[PDB]
Amino acid sequence: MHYTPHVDLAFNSVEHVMRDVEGGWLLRYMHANGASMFFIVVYLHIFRGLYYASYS
Amino acid sequence: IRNQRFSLLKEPISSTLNQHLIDYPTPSNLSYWWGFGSLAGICLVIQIVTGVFLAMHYTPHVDLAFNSVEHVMRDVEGGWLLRYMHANGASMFFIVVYLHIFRGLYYASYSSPREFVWCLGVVIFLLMIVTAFTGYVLPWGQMSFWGATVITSLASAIPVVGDTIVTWLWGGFSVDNATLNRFFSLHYLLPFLLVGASLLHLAALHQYGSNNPLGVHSEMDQISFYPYFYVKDLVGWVAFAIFFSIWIFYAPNVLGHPDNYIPANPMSTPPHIVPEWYFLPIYAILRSIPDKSGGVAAIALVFICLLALPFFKSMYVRSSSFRPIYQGIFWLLLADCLLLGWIGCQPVEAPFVTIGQISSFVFFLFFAITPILGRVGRGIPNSYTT
Amino acid sequence: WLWGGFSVDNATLNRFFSLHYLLPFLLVGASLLHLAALHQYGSNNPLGVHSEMDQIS
Amino acid sequence: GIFESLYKVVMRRNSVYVTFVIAGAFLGERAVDYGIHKLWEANNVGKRYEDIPVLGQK
Amino acid sequence: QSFLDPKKNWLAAQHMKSLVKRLSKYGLRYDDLYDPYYDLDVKEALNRLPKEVVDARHARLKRAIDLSMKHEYLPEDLQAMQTPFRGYLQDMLALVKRERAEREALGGLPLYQRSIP
Amino acid sequence: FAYFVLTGGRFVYASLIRLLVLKFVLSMSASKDVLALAS
Amino acid sequence: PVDQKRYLEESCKPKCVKPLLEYQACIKRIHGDDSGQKHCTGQYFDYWFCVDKCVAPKLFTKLK
Amino acid sequence: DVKAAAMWGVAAATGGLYLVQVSI
Amino acid sequence: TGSEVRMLDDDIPLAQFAVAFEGASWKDPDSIALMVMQAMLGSWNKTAGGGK
Amino acid sequence: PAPPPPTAMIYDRA
Amino acid sequence: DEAEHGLACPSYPWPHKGILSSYDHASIRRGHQVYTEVCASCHSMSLISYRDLVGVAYTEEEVKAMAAEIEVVDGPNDEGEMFTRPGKLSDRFPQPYANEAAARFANGGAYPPDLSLITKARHNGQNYVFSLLTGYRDPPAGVSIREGLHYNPYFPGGAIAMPKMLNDGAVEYEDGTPATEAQMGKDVVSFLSWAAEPEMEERKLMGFKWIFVLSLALLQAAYYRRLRWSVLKSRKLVLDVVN
Amino acid sequence: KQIVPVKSVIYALSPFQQKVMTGLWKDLPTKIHHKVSENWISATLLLGPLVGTYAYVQNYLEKEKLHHRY
Ligand code: HEC
Ligand code: HEM
Ligand code: HEM
Ligand code: HEM
């Protein structure tokens, strides 16, 4: 809702989200760190499946 | 029977697909008017694919939206075909949805068992209206910008929170870059909500079964869907493809508005601000009664009437083929809807405003006369009994 | 063809944005199929043994 | 006769039928393109880009 | 009712004539249009109806559906022999409705409820 | 005769599917602007 | 180089005799205005619409 | 069958050459 | 001529159907091959000792 | 022809 | 209401109108010449590049020379300053004015609109543009137009701020064809129609092909549906019921 | 949703043993007569308000235009 995909405006738009948008920094940090935790949880999912041989 | 493997359709990997698309029993007497649901699904898929391939060359910025659209038209190989397909297919999607709705109205495909199907259809109609509105705002043309401004200004009709709601929706004090980005995100998001709603629509109908032109209980004479209704649907798809190619390759901008090719100028205003042709009945219902909160209430009443249509009782005779009075009422309703749509593309002069006031009254008279007729005709068998 | 040109540029950025918006919904569908396929036979247990005897809602 | 013999030849096997379908689609598209191009050139005579009287006199 | 009687009202007489013509084309009675899935009172009435009557209704419905699929009507002789409005369901439907009404009036619980779709 | 009528229809459908797929792919491919800027 | 459009518009006057006469009558009746608020734009538009309808096919027939 | 697999491979190659159309 | 006759009753406990192609004449040399094809499509019965 | 009397067919009689 | 709505424009037999009709590329070239001669001093076409004219109205060498005879600004050099260099094939058409404010100031408060999509941005685009160009005539008796504004019946409102620029002999065509007002108007409208819709020829060819092919598909699909439904639509049903 | 059984005898012919598209353009005058006669009331009701309203609007606009002609 506040990201501009142009080459000259993507970085400026992300910084605008961080600074000007009310609570936008929370959205940006939550999206990035939630991608991180999504991969953490998926790796734990895969490793638990490997341990208990849930692929039988 | 389950001891060893049989036809792979019955296997669990394809069991649901088989049961809902191949072996599903449907009435054998379905006309060509029943292919419009599948045709609308095809139109929705076409819109999703074409939009996904357009978003790779569209920049949602006030200084780059129109230039990006023109870049798609000219520089992108096949981009003119892509955008023409997208716009004209939104038009055909609304066309086939209107045909779907009016066929349901004629054959009373909503009355007792398909009330949830009709309600899901109304929700789908709301989602399509919102998605098409945002998508039309996306190119950032003169007409697009001013239609967005006016239609969002309708939101300033709730007596308490109207101004707050419209200011929050605008992203500011006027339609600007924030509104463009907001509408782009919403216009991308909603079609997937539309897909989910369409899946729920199909499942809810498949719970009971498709209605037939006779309106009678159709379970003694039913046929499998695939070998017999895939070919009829294929005929419908090819005819729609001919129509769609006709409207793309030869009359691309006829359905569109010429003012949308003028870059959006907030300072100036077009002489006549009119929405897309498929919002014209709603716009005419809005402008019929002179008010703003009154017009929003009228639109809400229209949608409430559509939602409450299936919940009327004593509609024992379903199909309009066996109801002369209801058939006449339906044809008058269709004429009224066409006249209302024509009025919506006209100024607010005296004859136009008078006819719009009359047309909305007839539109609601349809939704009252139908329960009145059902209650009156509930006692038909005792009176004509021989 | 993936770059949409000769180097990573505005075309690549826009295409990647469209794909990044689209894919998580395909991810939603794939996860729904994941759950539906699991529910066909059940869920494994730390013992790995047959577990249709002591089962709770 | 002719239809039955052709049916035998191009539908004894489904793979052969699919290959014939692809080949016929290609050939029919080429023939339709050729015919439509001839019609277009016959209709639009003297208006083509190569038909401009001046092309290198600038 | 006064205006619904074809004898006292010309508009009702024309409506009855048109309805008879429409029903006789597909050769099914008026009560065949009633849907068991609609009210479930029709379902209970058909459950209480004799097997011969139910089978005849199903045969008439199948014939009408087949005729609609074929885009054709009954021949002239069968249309002449067609006798719509010869009721078989109205009396039992009224009885079921009366039983439901008295059950509702005297507290009670519905013998059957339409499942939420 | 019926199979060959269906075969002609399949000629038509295959042509349409092929051209639609190629149109989408080449639309996602490079554009005239970047092609000309290459020089 | 004389204008084909002007020549054919001059040649289409007989086809639009009635609108031209109506416009001339409007001018004659309106002559003598006090301050303003009076014009013959309707008759002007009718006459020139008739002339334009008369002139287009011949116009692009003569034009190359 | 070996012959069936070979004919299906030929059909797939023909379809690929119809789609991509390298040197027609 | 390819055709079908369906006599649905649902009053009989069991359903009996027969689907048949066109065979060969008595003197047709392929008649013996048709008998062999019948043999490799042999009959099965619920009370048959062969079982499965 | 004429419609059958209400005492001609089995379903009508029932 | 008539004056504010504007005079309706007649339907013209354009050379590029029809199912199998293409642009008159000679007329496209003449229209481009007259545009760059007597129309680029006020109007701009920012959506049209020079490379668009290659293979349509001019050869590649001609377009290269035409782009080289103009100077456009380029980005910062090694010294960080802005410089000007002769244009190239991919350069857009030059803008006569610096910006919209300069255009309005120079044209007496009126902004000359972009001509890239002018035939698509007006209802009845081609005929309207032709009539507006070649329809500067005396106002009807009764209406007075202010100084600095010229009367054009086809312009919405009656009064237009654009002086009559299409006068006989304004542009000397290289073809030797007469420089008539109507001829130059037709050439201008053809060039603008090409600029707004450069894909018309390919679009019409593809549309004709797919309409014919899909009509054949509709015939085959009807045959297929009737063949599949042949068993159902040609069956006898015995039901043991008469009324 | 369960299929109801009906005692019937059905005779059906193979799709390749009978004509396919010949029955389409057969009895066309009779088909057209049925379409016209069975639906003339519906066509009148659909196109009645439209044509009458269009004529009324055109007459009103013409009357106003000549009234404001000075
Ligand atoms: C400078 C004197 C100009 C030249 C040379 C041309 N045009 Fe023009 N044009 C000019 C102005 C100042 C305006 C604005 C008028 C207004 O009141 O908005 C215009 C406008 C147009 C339009 C728009 C008409 C409309 O209804 O919006 C068109 C289509 C147009 N001009 C076309 C045009 C052409 C084709 C020219 C080459 C012959 C041309 N103009 C030259 C100023 C000037
Ligand atoms: C997620 C999928 C979709 C995406 C990414 C998308 C994206 C876009 C974009 C970028 C445009 C502007 C480009 C142009 O019009 O040339 C547009 C226009 C439009 N879209 Fe969508 N869209 C999608 C789905 C839909 C759907 C489902 C509808 C119909 C409800 C729709 C209706 C429209 C309309 C009416 C326009 C205006 C076309 C015009 O006249 O310019 N879009 N869309
Ligand atoms: C996204 C648009 C829509 C799609 C894809 C869609 C899809 C479908 C499909 C596939 C069917 C089953 C096939 C059929 O019976 O025609 C169907 C049936 C139906 N739809 Fe929709 N639909 C859409 C919009 C609507 C709307 C807006 C309504 C109005 C409430 C509606 C009401 C119905 C009804 C009542 C049926 C039952 C048909 C019958 O039994 O006669 N649909 N739809
Ligand atoms: C989008 C990310 C994913 C989601 C949302 C997801 C979701 C789920 C859910 C809801 C279950 C059932 C509850 C449970 O964990 O026991 C499940 C089970 C399972 N998932 Fe996933 N999953 C994801 C990724 C993966 C991946 C990457 C794999 C690796 C192949 C995987 C393999 C499994 C297996 C083997 C089970 C069975 C658990 C067992 O019975 O032991 N999942 N998943």
Question: Is residue K132 within 8 Å of residue K138, measured between CB atoms?
Answer: no
Residue appearing with tokens 């299929």: L3
Pocket probe for ligand 3: among B100, B105, B117, the residue whose CB has the most ligand atoms within 8 Å is: B100
3-state class of K164 per DSSP?
Answer: coil
Number of Cα atoms under 13 Å in the Cβ half of residue I30: 4
User: Which residue is closest to B233 within chain K, CA to CA?
Assistant: K225
Q: Which candidate from K198, K203, K228 shows the least CB-CB separation from B249?
A: K203
Going by C-alpha positions, the residue among D12, K242, K146 that lies closest to residue E78 is: K242
3-class secondary structure for chain B? CCCCCCCHHHCCCCHHHHHHHCCCEEECCCCHHHHHHHHHHHHHHHHHHHHHHHCCCCCCCCCCHHHHHHHHHHCCCCHHHHHHHHHHHHHHHHHHHHHHHHHHHHHCCCCCCCHHHHHHHHHHHHHHHHHHHHHHHCCCEHHHHHHHHHHHHCCCCCCCCHHHHHHHHHCCCCCCHHHHHHHHHHHHHHHHHHHHHHHHHHHHHHHHCCCCCCCCCCCCCEEEHHHHHHHHHHHHHHHHHHHHHHHHHCCCCCCCCHHHHCECCCCCCCCCCCCCHHHHHHHHHHHHCCCCHHHHHHHHHHHHHHHHCCCCCCCCCCCHHHCHHHHHHHHHHHHHHHHHHHHHCCCCCHHHHHHHHHHHHHHHHHHHHHHHHHHHHCCHHHHHCC
Counting one residue from B and one from F, how many pairs have CB atoms under 8 Å apart? 32
Would you state the structure tokens that stand for residue B154, as one six-digit string?
A: 């309708």
3-state class of K49 per DSSP?
Answer: strand
Helix (H) or strand (E) holding K30: helix K25-38
CB contact under 8 A, D24 and F15: no
Give the other-Cβ count within 10 Å of K82's Cβ.
Answer: 9
The Cα of L70 is separated from the nearest Cα of chain G by a number of Å equal to: 6
Helix (H) or strand (E) holding K35: helix K25-38
> Does the beta carbon of K162 lie inside 6 Å of ligand 1?
yes
Q: Is B259 a catalytic residue?
A: no
User: CB-based contacts of L16: which residues, under 8 Å, 6+ apart?
Assistant: F2, I2, K227
User: Which residue is closest to L13 within chain I, CA to CA?
Assistant: I3
Domain hosting residue G6, numbered range: 1-64
Could you tell me the distance, in angstroms and rounded to a whole number, from the CA of residue K136 to the centre of ligand 1? 12
Query: What is the experimental method?
Result: cryo-EM
Domain count, chain E: 1
Contacts of J6 in chain E (CB under 8 A): 86
Q: Which of B38, B198, B210, B359 is catalytic?
A: B210
Could you tell me the distance, in angstroms and rounded to a whole number, from the CA of residue E63 to the centre of ligand 3? 27
Question: Is residue B164 within 8 Å of residue B157, measured between CB atoms?
Answer: no
> Does the beta carbon of K167 lie inside 6 Å of ligand 1?
no
Going by C-alpha positions, the residue among L16, F1, B222 that lies closest to residue K230 is: L16
- Touch between chain B and chain F: 3 or more Cβ pairs under 8 Å: yes
Question: Is residue K204 within 8 Å of residue K20, measured between CB atoms?
Answer: yes
> Does the beta carbon of B143 lie inside 6 Å of ligand 2?
no
B209 in the Ramachandran plot: left (φ > 0), alpha (ψ -120 to 50) or beta? left
Q: Whose CA is nearest to atom 24 of ligand 3?
A: B121
Helices (H) and strands (E) in chain E, counts: 6, 0
The CA–CA distances, whole Å, from C45 to A52, B71, C35, C55, G35 equal: 8, 57, 16, 11, 99
Beta strands in chain K (DSSP E): 71-74, 83-86, 150-151, 159-160, 236-238
Q: Which candidate from H4, H7, H14 shows the least CB-CB separation from D23?
A: H14
Ligand 3 cavity residues, CB under 6 Å: B 34, 36-38, 40-41, 44, 97, 100-101, 104, 107, 109-110, 114, 117-118, 121-122, 124-125, 198, 201-202, 205, 210-211
Contacts of L16 in chain F (CB under 8 A): 2
Give the other-Cβ count within 10 Å of K105's Cβ.
Answer: 13
Q: Is B10 a catalytic residue?
A: no
Residue appearing with tokens 């300033």: B156
The Cα of L23 is separated from the nearest Cα of chain E by a number of Å equal to: 12
The CA–CA distances, whole Å, from A16 to A8, A29, B173, C16 equal: 13, 13, 18, 21
Beta bridge partners of B223: B26
Domain count, chain G: 1
Question: Is residue D22 within 8 Å of residue F18, measured between CB atoms?
Answer: no
Domain hosting residue D6, numbered range: 1-58
Backbone angles phi, psi at I3, to 5 degrees: -160, 170
CA dist B143 and B257 (Å) reads 8
- Touch between chain A and chain I: 3 or more Cβ pairs under 8 Å: no
Residue appearing with tokens 């009156």: B376
CA dist K89 and K59 (Å) reads 11
Would you state the structure tokens that stand for residue B313, as one six-digit string?
A: 């009782």
> Does the beta carbon of K9 lie inside 6 Å of ligand 1?
no
- Touch between chain I and chain D: 3 or more Cβ pairs under 8 Å: no
User: CB-based contacts of B305: which residues, under 8 Å, 6+ apart?
Assistant: B364, B367
Q: Whose CA is nearest to atom 22 of ligand 3?
A: B37
CB contact under 8 A, C1 and F38: no
CB contact under 8 A, L53 and B355: yes
The Cα of K226 is separated from the nearest Cα of chain E by a number of Å equal to: 12
Residue E22 at interface with chain L, using a CB cutoff of 8 Å: no
Beta bridge partners of K71: K86
CA dist G2 and E76 (Å) reads 78
K122 is in an annotated binding site: yes
Q: Is B77 a catalytic residue?
A: no
Domain hosting residue E58, numbered range: 2-117
* DSSP symbol at K54: B
Interface of B with F in 22-61 (CB under 8 A): 49, 53, 56-57
Q: Is B210 a catalytic residue?
A: yes
CA dist F18 and H20 (Å) reads 9
Q: Which candidate from L1, L4, L57 shows the least CB-CB separation from B220?
A: L4
The CA–CA distances, whole Å, from B19 to B11, B224, C44, I27 equal: 11, 10, 29, 48
Could you tell me the distance, in angstroms and rounded to a whole number, from the CA of residue K42 to the centre of ligand 1? 8
Domain count, chain D: 1
3-state class of I6 per DSSP?
Answer: strand
Give the full edge-to-edge strand order of the sheet including K236-238.
Answer: I3-6, L9-13, K236-238
Q: Is K210 exposed, middle or buried (0-12, 13-18, 19+ CB in 10 A)?
A: buried
* Resolution in angstrom units: 3.2
Residue J2 at interface with chain E, using a CB cutoff of 8 Å: yes
> Does the beta carbon of K110 lie inside 6 Å of ligand 1?
yes
Which residues of G have a CB under 8 Å from any CB of K? Answer: 1-6, 23, 26-27, 30-31, 33, 36, 38-45, 48-49, 52-53, 55-57, 59-60, 62-64
The CA–CA distances, whole Å, from E51 to E45, E46, E58 equal: 12, 9, 10
3-state class of A5 per DSSP?
Answer: coil
Beta bridge partners of B27: B222
